[PDB]
Amino acid sequence: IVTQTMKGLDIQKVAGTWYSLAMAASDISLLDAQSAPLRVYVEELKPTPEGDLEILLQKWENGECAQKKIIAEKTKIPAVFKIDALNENKVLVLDTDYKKYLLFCMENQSLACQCLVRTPEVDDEALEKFDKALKALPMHIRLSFNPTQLEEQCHI
Amino acid sequence: IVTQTMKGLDIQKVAGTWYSLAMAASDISLLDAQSAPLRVYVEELKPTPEGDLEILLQKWENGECAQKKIIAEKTKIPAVFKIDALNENKVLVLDTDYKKYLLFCMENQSLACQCLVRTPEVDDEALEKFDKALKALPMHIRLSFNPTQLEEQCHI
Ligand SMILES: CCCCCCCCCCCCCCCC(=O)O
Numbered sequence: 584i585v586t587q588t589m590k591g592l593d594i595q596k597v598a599g600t601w602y603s604l605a606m607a608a609s610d611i612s613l614l615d616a617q618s619a620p621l622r623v624y625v626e627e628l629k630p631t632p633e634g635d636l637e638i639l640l641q642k643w644e645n646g647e648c649a650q651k652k653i654i655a656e657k658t659k660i661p662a663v664f665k666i667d668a669l670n671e672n673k674v675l676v677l678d679t680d681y682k683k684y685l686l687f688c689m690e691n692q693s694l695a696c697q698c699l700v701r702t703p704e705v706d707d708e709a710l711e712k713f714d715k716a717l718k719a720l721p722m723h724i725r726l727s728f729n730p731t732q733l734e735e736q737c738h739i
Numbered sequence: 740i741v742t743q744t745m746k747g748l749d750i751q752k753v754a755g756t757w758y759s760l761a762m763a764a765s766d767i768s769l770l771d772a773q774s775a776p777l778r779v780y781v782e783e784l785k786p787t788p789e790g791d792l793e794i795l796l797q798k799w800e801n802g803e804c805a806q807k808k809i810i811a812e813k814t815k816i817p818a819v820f821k822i823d824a825l826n827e828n829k830v831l832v833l834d835t836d837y838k839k840y841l842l843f844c845m846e847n848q849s850l851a852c853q854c855l856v857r858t859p860e861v862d863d864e865a866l867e868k869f870d871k872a873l874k875a876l877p878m879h880i881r882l883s884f885n886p887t888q889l890e891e892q893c894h895i
């Protein structure tokens with residue numbers, strides 16, 4: 584928890600458009616419902632000059648796919664960020680090649696991880712790396728999305 | 740779909756108590772909600788003398804974990820059964836060692852598969868066989884349960 588972070592991460596280089604191709608979580612309840620707590624769909628990453636990371640994502644809330652904006656502040660570790668809210672919340676970058684895929688986990692046990700990809704395409708190779716990275720962890724739900732869903736709001 | 744069935748299946752030998760240790764499905768919607776269509780928890784298998792298979796399971800329906808009794812009739816293929824209802828529905832036995840684990844899929848595309856085990860224990864070896872069997876298939880949700888859940892009705 585978690586035993587992989589990426590060495591030599593350049594945060595400025597994860598900038599831009601992402602798709603949440605697959606999500607996994609330690610507890611069924613974290614991803615189960617459409618309004619489930621960690622069931623979130625990444626849209627864009629906006630690294631600040633000071634090295635913080637602004638995240639744009641969608642979440643299903645009322646009975647509606649809602650927009651969100653959250654701030655992840657840098658820590659001393661280049662691959663690890665803290666989310667602004669309660670209580671608190673660590674984001675860890677496990678692996679990325681910047682131009683294709685990015686694996687991250689969010690913890691706080693309580694744990695969810697996603698495979699991000701740059702395009703609305705099923706990347707078998709990034710998915711295989713996501714599954715390799717997660718065999719080490721205690722995940723009890725896993726979801727993956729098809730290209731049609733990846734182009735809809737909240738992957739409907 | 741599906742490309743593995745078990746050779747030399749003796750149906751009388753799958754008789755008795757089972758636990759649904761892991762479930763996977765082609766479509767998120769088939770397992771997503773607690774009342775989702777293929778979200779079913781196997782309790783016991785009762786093979787008839789004529790080679791049909793009576794299945795006792797639990798399903799979440801009203802706002803309640805309900806009991807069910809379904810009949811799977813034999814076909815010409817020893818590892819494949821047809822479920823009584825609409826419209827219609829094929830059950831295929833992929834692999835079992837009788838005394839520990841049993842892998843099956845239900846189709847009708849539309850596809851769900853489970854890893855059954857004889858005890859409320861996490862069998863890493865049967866799970867690895869379930870994952871091997873499913874790498875071949877187009878699954879978009881996967882769930883697994885812990886021993887505590889396995890001893891509760893509807894794995895709550
Ligand atoms: C490298 C960047 C990875 C992206 C990290 C995404 C972090 C998302 C964490 C959001 C937590 C849940 C937010 C839901 C807010 C709510 O409705 O309560």
Ligand SMILES: CCCCCCCCCCCCCCCC(=O)O
Nearest residue numbers: 776777779784794798830832843845
């Ligand atoms: C070797 C035996 C494997 C066990 C096969 C279990 C088959 C279960 C299929 C049930 C289909 C869904 C039933 C729900 C009925 C409903 O509420 O509509």
